[PDB]
Motif scaffolding. Sequence first.
Motif, PDB file in Angstrom:
ATOM      1  N   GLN A   1     117.335 120.700  52.674  1.00 24.10           N
ATOM      2  CA  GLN A   1     116.846 121.928  52.579  1.00 24.10           C
ATOM      3  C   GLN A   1     115.910 122.420  51.561  1.00 24.10           C
ATOM      4  OE1 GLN A   1     117.310 122.093  56.036  1.00 24.10           O
ATOM      5  NE2 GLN A   1     118.232 124.210  55.916  1.00 24.10           N
TER       6      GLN A   1
ATOM      7  N   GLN B   1     107.933 124.968  51.843  1.00 22.54           N
ATOM      8  CA  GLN B   1     108.045 124.878  53.320  1.00 22.54           C
ATOM      9  C   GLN B   1     107.686 123.170  53.544  1.00 22.54           C
ATOM     10  OE1 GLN B   1     110.082 126.018  56.562  1.00 22.54           O
ATOM     11  NE2 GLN B   1     110.018 124.125  55.580  1.00 22.54           N
TER      12      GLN B   1
ATOM     13  N   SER C   1     117.786 116.134  58.216  1.00 19.61           N
ATOM     14  CA  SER C   1     117.841 117.590  58.184  1.00 19.61           C
ATOM     15  C   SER C   1     118.724 118.121  57.187  1.00 19.61           C
ATOM     16  CB  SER C   1     117.984 117.879  59.612  1.00 19.61           C
ATOM     17  OG  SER C   1     119.487 117.279  60.102  1.00 19.61           O
ATOM     18  N   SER C   2     119.671 117.342  56.630  1.00 26.10           N
ATOM     19  CA  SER C   2     120.487 117.959  55.436  1.00 26.10           C
ATOM     20  C   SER C   2     119.632 118.198  54.368  1.00 26.10           C
ATOM     21  CB  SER C   2     121.739 116.989  55.360  1.00 26.10           C
ATOM     22  OG  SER C   2     121.029 115.613  54.922  1.00 26.10           O
TER      23      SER C   2
ATOM     24  N   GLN D   1     112.446 115.874  54.397  1.00 27.86           N
ATOM     25  CA  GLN D   1     113.069 115.593  55.494  1.00 27.86           C
ATOM     26  C   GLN D   1     112.903 114.229  56.309  1.00 27.86           C
ATOM     27  OE1 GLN D   1     112.742 119.484  57.300  1.00 27.86           O
ATOM     28  NE2 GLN D   1     114.760 120.300  56.340  1.00 27.86           N
TER      29      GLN D   1
ATOM     30  N   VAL E   1     109.477 120.481  51.754  1.00 29.58           N
ATOM     31  CA  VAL E   1     110.624 120.221  52.296  1.00 29.58           C
ATOM     32  C   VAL E   1     110.414 119.359  53.667  1.00 29.58           C
ATOM     33  CG1 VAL E   1     112.655 121.160  53.216  1.00 29.58           C
ATOM     34  CG2 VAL E   1     111.840 122.105  51.182  1.00 29.58           C
TER      35      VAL E   1
END
Length: 318
Positions: A317, A302, A314-315, A309, A305
């Motif tokens: 993931q 998490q 935000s694309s 980002q 990522v």
Amino acid sequence: EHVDHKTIARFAEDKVNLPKVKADDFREQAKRLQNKLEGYLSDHPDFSLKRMIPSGSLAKGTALRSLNDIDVAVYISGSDAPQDLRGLLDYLADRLRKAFPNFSPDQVKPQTYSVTVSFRGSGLDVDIVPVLYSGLPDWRGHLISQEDGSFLETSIPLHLDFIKARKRAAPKHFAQVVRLAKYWARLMKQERPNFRFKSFMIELILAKLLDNGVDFSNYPEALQAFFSYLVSTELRERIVFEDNYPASKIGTLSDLVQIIDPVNPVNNVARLYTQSNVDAIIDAAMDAGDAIDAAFYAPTKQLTVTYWQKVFGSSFQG
Ligand SMILES: Nc1ncnc2c1ncn2[C@@H]1O[C@H](COP(=O)(O)OP(=O)(O)OP(=O)(O)O)[C@@H](O)[C@H]1O
Ligand SMILES: [Cl-]
Ligand SMILES: [Mg+2]
């Protein structure tokens, strides 16, 4: 571990790259126009439009999924053509209507520095940039800048050769890193005040790094080399290539940022970049490089990522 080269490559295929099926459709679109002009010129040898060359990301293999226009250069010869910018674009539009009689006249539309041929959904719009041509070697001529309308003496065929050479030196990977850097730059233009970063400049900077031995087969490391180059040099180091002329031939310039056209030693691709632009690029590159380093060391997927980002939005993931 959490995010590695393969993660980035899969993200690029999924979200960044123009799919090959679409790229082929668009290239066939441009080829049909090319063939129509060639057939018209074969019947009318005096016609002033002499050649159409696909010139943009589609031709180079660096198109993004967000592509919405197909770039072609059209070479214009003869005494009739005005030298004034507005007059030349009106002249080009009129010649295009004559060569493409099946198009409704309103499908050819002059813009600020180019002429649009609109297909009205049955294909993408084609953006046509004139090149005033008088027979100089290597199909050199005066291309209209899409930044300020300046006439720039250069060679699109030699630019395509230049890009081909780097793609042969690093198959797949050079074009992929260009695309990832272009995708980052698009996000930064929306997020960072005074951020500007032309795609041809991104390609020339990445070509210098490849020439210098940067390994493009690891995309996180290649991006880090790009961002670290920007932060360390602060874009004050001249970028020049010897493909077509030696370093002795480069003309001295007083421009703040100097990234010299590999065809024409007096044409600085970065001539319009200001210190405000440079500062925004440097801050953005520092932040991106810092995010990639933190992502490498982040203890959880998490957190990894979240850091990526910051680079890709935000694309991304994971
Ligand atoms: N300053 C310049 N001097 C000489 N030629 C240029 C200059 N800027 C662009 N070109 C020519 O126009 C082509 C297109 O460059 P541009 O930066 O428009 O990017 P692109 O590859 O079409 O990417 P995109 O449109 O997706 O941003 C270049 O490959 C080059 O032939
Ligand atoms: Cl294109
Ligand atoms: Mg383009």
